[PDB]
Amino acid sequence: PSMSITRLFPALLECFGIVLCGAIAGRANVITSTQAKGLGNFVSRFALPALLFKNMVVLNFSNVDWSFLYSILIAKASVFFIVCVLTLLVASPDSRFSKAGLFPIFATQSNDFALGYPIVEALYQTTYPEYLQYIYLVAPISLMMLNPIGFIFCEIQKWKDQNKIKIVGLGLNPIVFMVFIGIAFNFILDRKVPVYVENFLDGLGNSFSGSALFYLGLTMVGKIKRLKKSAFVVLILLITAKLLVLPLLCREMVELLDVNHTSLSNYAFLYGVFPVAPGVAIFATQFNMEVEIITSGMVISTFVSAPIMYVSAWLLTFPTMPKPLAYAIQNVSFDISIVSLISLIWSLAILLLSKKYKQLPHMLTTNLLIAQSIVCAGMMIWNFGQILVFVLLYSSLYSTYLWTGLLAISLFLLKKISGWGIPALLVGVLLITGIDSAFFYGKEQMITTAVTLFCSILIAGIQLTRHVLLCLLLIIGLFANLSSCLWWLFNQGRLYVELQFFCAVFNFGQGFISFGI
Amino acid sequence: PSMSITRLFPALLECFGIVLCGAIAGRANVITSTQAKGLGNFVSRFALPALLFKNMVVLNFSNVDWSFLYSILIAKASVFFIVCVLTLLVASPDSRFSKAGLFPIFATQSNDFALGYPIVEALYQTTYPEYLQYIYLVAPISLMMLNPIGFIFCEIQKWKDQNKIKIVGLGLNPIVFMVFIGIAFNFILDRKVPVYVENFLDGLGNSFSGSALFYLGLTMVGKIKRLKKSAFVVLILLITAKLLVLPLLCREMVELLDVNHTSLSNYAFLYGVFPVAPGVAIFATQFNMEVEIITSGMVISTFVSAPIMYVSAWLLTFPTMPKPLAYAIQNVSFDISIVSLISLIWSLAILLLSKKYKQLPHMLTTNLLIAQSIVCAGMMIWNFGQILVFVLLYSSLYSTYLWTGLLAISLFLLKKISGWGIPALLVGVLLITGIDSAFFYGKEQMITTAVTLFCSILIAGIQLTRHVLLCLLLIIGLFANLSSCLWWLFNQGRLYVELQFFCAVFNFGQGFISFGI
């Protein structure tokens, strides 16, 4: 693989670690507001321009692929055009220009240095180093070209509150100043840096990415607001347009403009899937316009982009490797299972702290969570009689289905001993007497499972209400893996693999859906 | 001569004609304020950018002499440094920064397109066409480099009323926008212009210089104010620093950096001697700072630069040609005599309208003016018995000296028949019985004159007070030409020629000194 997915997961977890440490620092108030703004200055005024100038004078113009760069830029501008015209066709004139401004720029800007560069650079430090210059080629040009549009769009708003006076007088940020500034010096110098300032630049600009994520975490606390009325819907519309559609538009426009291209097209999709940048977050603050829906977009952007970038990074490579396809699905199930335990350990603690043993489904939900916790504490066995211990884990896997079927019975009781009964104990008897959980032995494993999961989905077809919602969201994955178990058992085509991945991320990730519940 | 002085005078008079037509249009109100601002828009927004872009894309970068250009620029910056430090050493801190700002920029900017380009282009259309590109090479770079200094100097003033906020945030005009803009297109295009827009550009930008001077004339009315207290002194200090010193500094810095160079060094002095530009005039309006001393500088700048540019243009060429030295002095005396009649005809009309025949020296002053009017109506004979008619003119020339001696007697009477007596009638008898006025015959002409002019200067040594002042200012030229008549009569050396020029501009120009009186 051109990208090192073996490192993708690792690199994803370190960036997540810094950003969540920043989040918990903001929550626990271990960092004072004074030194918080001090670090904000240290990044924005000092370290951000530092790495900009450093990497841009380092940036090599010997070969600048205009195909990929201009394809990305015009795809971004297309996203701007489609979104801005649609919102002018749906929004009210009053908020139309205002909504054909910030909303596009909020759906087009990728915090490239925050996570991406770290991720893509960990994915391509040896294979395609040019991608480390495309990342700082794309963003600055996007800022210079397309930001003025949305900016002048808002000038028409302050008009509603003078073309050359304000519309373009004020229509046309240290990034672009230092960016273009680093281009003047890269031409003045022979793309070189003198040691005297070079040491300071390296010391200061390489201490930014982690600090940038730390500041982001300091800016993710107390930001999401209850906006379900009409904002969460348009919020998730913006999120999908920026996180899937925009990558899809780039993936198609690169193939209409530019196997290396395939991975480059995979890199195209690899781009745009980045969460939204804080540049728009501070632009809205300057425009003091509906920051709550933009700050929420900032939060959920990372919150959902992280799982999406992970799953997509795995998906785009499966056509490229059946034996490594089994190894890849095993590895991804293993890793998601690990973080699954993260969510599974935070879940059991919060349920025991909140006294969820109550006779309501809450106690039934505590059972589901402990079952999944066993499912992942068994998944830690997977990599490093070693299956005679796997049998209890796989029983616990079946358990997740039996407990949720009886929880469906409980919610039916809400509208009107089997818990620990565990008919899957007889499934274990079948296992003992009659590489993966589905490779336990022959075709009986996913047969005994095919029937058990179906018994629960039928029981399903026949904050307690929040637990009912959890039951629904999980029986979605019940259908998902039902489709897998019937498909393989009927016929053992580049289609069974993706549903393998989906039932993996469902059977290994529902812990998160319950985490939210 | 590299410059066509034969055309210098002609070209000087046409530009003067347009600018004085603008002045008289502003005075007589034949142009309404509405169409006045309409023409102001037509020039500034339409025709100024037109010719900027046109000539700059036409501008050839095949050979750009950096020696001359950078020498001029650093000389201008030196003028900025010396003037700004001195005024910070003399002005009060309160008005110091304010006076180390506008005052330098008011002493460094040349309205290059207004008169110069027309003049220098008439002087070099065939000899040195590169000077037509140096004129638009110098100015824009001066605006881009040195204007920000004085501008930020005034930002420190508004501070007295924030480095990146205002000092440089507001520190860094359509000229520089279109100027640099015409550089981007001159690189984009092959220094070419498409006919479609080329015709409009030529039609619009070639109708600017005359219209620019017309607007200047509309901005010269009701601008000078009585500022003798401490402003006229610093005003004339600024004027001399910009009109002689600055050209001298350029003339020396070009010889330390760059016969062609000699004329190029003469061109160096030919530059800087231009009157101040209206860019500073509108900058001060934007800064609303002591416009009266800046508007007065605008007025007197042209008012005195025009005679100075003329006389200097003649002076710098005299070492370059004795027979053509006599032809040149004859031509310059002829031309100054012509305009002399302009001042002499406006003078007699105003004195007869004001009833100056009063027994006070006013009537004696009316006699001086009519004598000088005869002196110039005889000078019109000079180019195209033809000397037996010259005799009355030369008698009238001696008359100017005899009337002013008896006017000195009159002013002595003020502190205590000879008018028309005219002992110069006996000088005419000497002329008849005993190429130029000094070439009338042998050495007796400037001998009979040597004694007559001395008799008046001795009578001098032995608004009536304004007429006394006029007598003093003219007896200055009496000394000046006394030095000539004694020098030639004693010894007939690149020194007698310049005093020939001075006694010419005095004996042919006092009409102006009396014009003011």
PDB file of C-alpha atoms in Angstrom, chain A residues 45 164, chain B residues 45 164:
ATOM      1  CA  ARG A  45       2.061  34.485  16.101  1.00  0.00           C
ATOM      2  CA  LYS A 164     -14.790  49.529  -3.554  1.00  0.00           C
TER       3      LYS A 164
ATOM      4  CA  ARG B  45     -10.322  57.142 -11.988  1.00  0.00           C
ATOM      5  CA  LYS B 164       0.625  46.215  13.651  1.00  0.00           C
TER       6      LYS B 164
END
